[PDB]
């Protein structure tokens, strides 16, 4: 049959928040639509404005001896006038008395774009990179640099990055298999299978982020501060959707490609001459990174299987330098970035842990009803679906032919 | 079936640290996810702000008759005004009265980029190098140099490096194997195997760091000085993640490459003609160092196996000069670099040692559940996984075909 989405009843309203002036309630999901069913709408929260009983009195420690930026971030006094922006809106450079003192002291450096986006936020489900939560325009008055071999140019290193090494390396692989069975006795039988696999990687650099004493962007801290004190599933699920659930503490950059090819053959002769011939083919290719000119040409050449020259491979490898992607990650939980000096920071961290665990528990493929004949279940926008093998071409993998 | 990540219960909160104003606790990991299980979040620490009972009185002894840099690093008075920066930010060059006295005395020398980044910190698991903890711009009023034959240029030697030898040498290795067994009696059988291995290495230089009277960067000393006095697993694990566990006391630089080929064949005939033919290949190529134009060209030329010209080998050889890598290391523990002149430095050394032992004990392949039919177990980002030979293609290496 067809299975429709069904959702749980709502919970009880919370009390009025003195500062947000809102109340919250939540529900749960039981079954996803399957077999041309209705997909779930995923509205798992609710909010309604209220009238608080107590005034919102919220205070945090002042900088003290440190400077107060116009955006609220406390920075050190020695950074009042130099060659860099530290408050995030050039709030400190607008009151320079006299004699600016750049930290690099006339040395020639360049701002690396490779290190300006490091530390991508990653959703645990789907592994889609997001915008980095860090602020990599902050230098803390230092002139740390590093040299790139290809261009003989020194790139200055941000504060949050603890390691940035430019390196040249590559990988390749080519595995093929071939089996063949022939049975005859009249009677006959012939079998043939063939598997191919080509995969290669190109590496550009590798970075390591910091753990203690980091500086985050103002918008991230503002969105953290807006969280409710108690535990509301909807608001924390929204935060986890916006900012991901884990962030890349280290990774590598470059490009890659792949190719998968499967061949199948069958036959049977009897003697009532009954002869059958079965042929099933499937070719898959993928490619990521580089420039949109060389890469697609290389992708189309790889698909034919014809022998091609090295110049296009070199062109693509050289073009990787201007549009790299993220090939390796090392995930770390998002609640580690909560600033320590903040009202009820520990409660926010515990709640973020619980919300990540509940988010993993929900939106799970394990709740989908099992398919038939060893099919594979995939979850896609709140609707379960089955993937079928070569012989079966049903919606639920039930039609055999 | 499937195994999910599980972690031990929390430990008890410690007392409030009078200077950090925090308290810490920690837990452990019991099992990693395996067989499509949930990977571990690796949250082994916790921290929370507290209120101290006694005010934090923190100080270190001043230089005395030595100069006091603005970052705290003591340097000798004879270095107050010369041709080099010793404070790390040109704090000593801001009061040069008259008659500058450069140390090298007009001789033409260059800053060697090879020795400027020597002394990489190395993580014990994965052997990924990190940024050097030493500050290689300190010269201590010396003009030690060394000659490179290729360019006939003399390169200054920093204080921390005790040896800098430029030398040219090359190696190669070429081993092939071939077996062929034929068994028949009707009956028949034919077996055949073939193995390839090519590898050669290029050396550029070799360095040895110092042991006594070394100078470290300010940031490393500050990160050490912020550590809690007692033993807290989380904070010292964070320190290890940031700075690695070992640092290379000596090493070499250059490049290398590899090529690995495996062939396998089999047959079996019975007589009802039953015939079987299996053919299996596997090729791997790797290359590190050099420039991304010639290097990848040679990588591709190697795969096709045709005879190539020597000019590309020579071109890659000449380009290895501009982007060397770390081919050989000799690790030393990181706690040997804890300065003697510091509050409770010995306790920091003991804690670091115990934390390195604990970090080795966890994240070990030994807790992963074993595979079946001779599989190989690899741990990758908190998730055990099995590697299967040519014959088996199951998830647990149990499906044979």
């Amino acid at each position, epitope marked *: 049959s067809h299975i429709d989405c069904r959702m749980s009843p709502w919970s009880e309203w919370s*009390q009025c928040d003195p500062c947000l002036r809102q109340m919250f309630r939540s529900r749960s999901i039981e079954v996803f639509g399957q077999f041309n069913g209705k997909r779930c709408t995923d509205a798992v929260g609710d909010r309604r404005q209220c009238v608080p*009983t*107590e*005034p919102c*009195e919220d*205070a945090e*420690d*002042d900088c*003290g001896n440190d400077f107060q930026c116009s955006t609220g971030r406390c920075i050190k006094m020695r950074l009042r006038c130099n060659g860099d922006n530290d408050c995030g809106d050039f709030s400190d450079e607008d009151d320079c008395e006299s004699e600016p003192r750049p930290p690099c002291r006339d040395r020639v450096v360049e701002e690396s774009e490779l290190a300006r986006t490091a530390g991508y936020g990653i959703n645990i489900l789907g592994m889609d990179p997001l915008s980095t939560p860090f602020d990599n325009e902050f230098y803390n008055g230092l002139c740390n640099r590093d040299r790139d071999g290809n261009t003989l140019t020194y790139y200055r290193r941000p504060w949050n990055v603890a390691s940035l090494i430019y390196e040249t390396k590559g990988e390749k692989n080519f595995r093929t298999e071939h089996y063949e069975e022939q049975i005859e006795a009249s009677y006959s039988s012939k079998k043939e299978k063939m598997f191919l696999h080509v995969k290669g990687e190109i590496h550009l650099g590798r970075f390591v982020m910091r753990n203690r004493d980091v500086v985050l962007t103002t918008t991230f801290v503002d969105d953290i501060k807006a969280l409710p*004190t*108690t535990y509301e599933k909807g608001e924390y699920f929204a935060f986890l959707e916006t900012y991901g659930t884990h962030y890349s503490s280290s990774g590598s950059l470059g490009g890659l490609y792949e190719l998968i090819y499967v061949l199948d053959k069958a036959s049977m002769k009897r003697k009532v001459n009954i002869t059958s011939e079965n042929l099933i083919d499937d070719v898959v290719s993928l490619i990521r990174g580089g420039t949109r000119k060389y890469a697609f040409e290389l992708k189309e050449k790889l698909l034919r299987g014809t022998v091609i020259d090295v110049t296009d491979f070199v062109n693509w490898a050289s073009s990787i330098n201007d549009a790299p992607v993220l090939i390796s990650q090392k995930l770390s939980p998002i609640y580690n970035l909560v600033p320590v000096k903040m*009202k*009820n920071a*520990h*409660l926010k961290k515990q709640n973020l842990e619980r919300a990540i665990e509940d988010y993993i528990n929900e939106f799970s493929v394990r709740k989908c009803h099992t398919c038939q004949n060893g099919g594979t279940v995939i979850l896609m926008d709140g609707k379960c679906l089955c993937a079928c093998p070569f012989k079966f071409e049903g919606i639920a993998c039930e039609i055999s032919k | 079936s499937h195994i999910d990540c599980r972690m031990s219960p929390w430990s008890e*909160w410690s007392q409030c640290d009078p200077c950090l104003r925090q308290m810490f606790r920690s837990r452990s990991i019991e099992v990693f996810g395996q067989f499509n299980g949930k990977r571990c979040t690796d949250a082994v620490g916790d921290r*929370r*702000q*507290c*209120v*101290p*009972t*006694e*005010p934090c009185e923190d100080a270190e002894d001043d230089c005395g008759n030595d100069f006091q840099c603005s970052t705290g690093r003591c340097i000798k008075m004879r270095l107050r005004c010369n041709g080099d920066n010793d404070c790390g930010d040109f704090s000593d060059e801001d009061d040069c009265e008259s008659e500058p006295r450069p140390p090298c005395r007009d001789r033409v020398v260059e800053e060697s980029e090879l020795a400027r980044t020597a002394g990489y910190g190395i993580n014990i698991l994965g052997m990924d190098p990190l940024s050097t903890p030493f500050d290689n711009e300190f010269y201590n009023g010396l003009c030690n140099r060394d000659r490179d034959g290729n360019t006939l240029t003399y390169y200054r030697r920093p204080w921390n490096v005790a040896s800098l030898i430029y030398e040219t040498k090359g190696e190669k290795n070429f081993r092939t194997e071939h077996y062929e067994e034929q068994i028949e009696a009707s009956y028949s059988s034919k077996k055949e195997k073939m193995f390839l291995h090519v590898k050669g290495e290029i050396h550029l230089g070799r360095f040895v760091m110092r042991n006594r009277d070394v100078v470290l960067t300010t940031t490393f000393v500050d990160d050490i000085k912020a550590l809690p006095t007692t033993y807290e697993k989380g904070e010292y694990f964070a320190f290890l993640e940031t700075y690695g566990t070992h640092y290379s006391s000596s090493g070499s630089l250059g490049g290398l490459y590899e090529l690995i080929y495996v062939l396998d064949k089999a047959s079996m005939k019975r007589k009802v003609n039953i015939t079987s033919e299996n053919l299996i290949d596997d090729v791997v190529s790797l290359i590190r160092g050099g420039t991304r134009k010639y290097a990848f060209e040679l990588k591709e030329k190697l795969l096709r196996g045709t005879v190539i010209d020597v000019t590309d080998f020579v071109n890659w050889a000449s380009s290895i000069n501009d982007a060397p890598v770390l081919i050989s290391q000799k690790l030393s523990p990181i706690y040997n670099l804890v300065p003697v002149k510091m509050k409770n430095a010995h306790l920091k050394k003991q804690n670091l040692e115990r934390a390195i032992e604990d970090y080795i004990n966890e994240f070990s392949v030994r807790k992963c559940h074993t595979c079946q039919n001779g599989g190989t177990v690899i741990l990758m980002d908190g998730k055990c996984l099995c590697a299967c030979p040519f014959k088996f293609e199951g998830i647990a290496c149990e499906i044979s075909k």
Partner: antibody
Amino acid sequence: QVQLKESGPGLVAPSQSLSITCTVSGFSLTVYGVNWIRQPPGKGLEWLGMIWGDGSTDYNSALKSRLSITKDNSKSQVFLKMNSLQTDDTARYYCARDRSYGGSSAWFGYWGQGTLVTVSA
Amino acid sequence: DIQMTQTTSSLSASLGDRVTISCRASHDISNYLNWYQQKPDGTLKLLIYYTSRLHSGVPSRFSGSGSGTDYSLTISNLEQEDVATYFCQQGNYLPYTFGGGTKLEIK
């Protein structure tokens, strides 16, 4: 509408335990902490102890071995247990709310009403 | 234990006059001071926290100032509803300590 009510025995033996209850209203104890303060006659105030919203307890250095604070967040009630009383423990006992969930520099915004406990000599 | 001293145990003034109450701390508490008011029959109420900040529900006649070690609480336009005893308490290191207490009278 934040308010706190207090209940005490009133008369205790010179060697008999205490049992004091401070029920809260207008807020939940899960995200706030409660402090206990006593005022001996003719003198000033004195901070005694504190319990966090989490469950952690802090005590003054002198009365560490005597005090005991317990919480029941279901009924929104706070208990104080003091044992082996002396004649100097006669004071007015207040309960006041903490600034936040707990673990930071604090001011006591909302106070109780006050309960006097006399130890017979 | 930080010791805070209030020298003026008593003070007498008339309506409409400015009165200043001085409270001096032992250590340096880093601008963490609070003022409490105690009318008779044991009622307490926080007026000034963080050494310059009016608590919600408190009229604007009360104001505080001071920094470092010496602080003062200034009452302007004294009325007949401001006859109480004022306390100073620190909140930097636990245990928290209160001051001696100054009783304000009107003549």
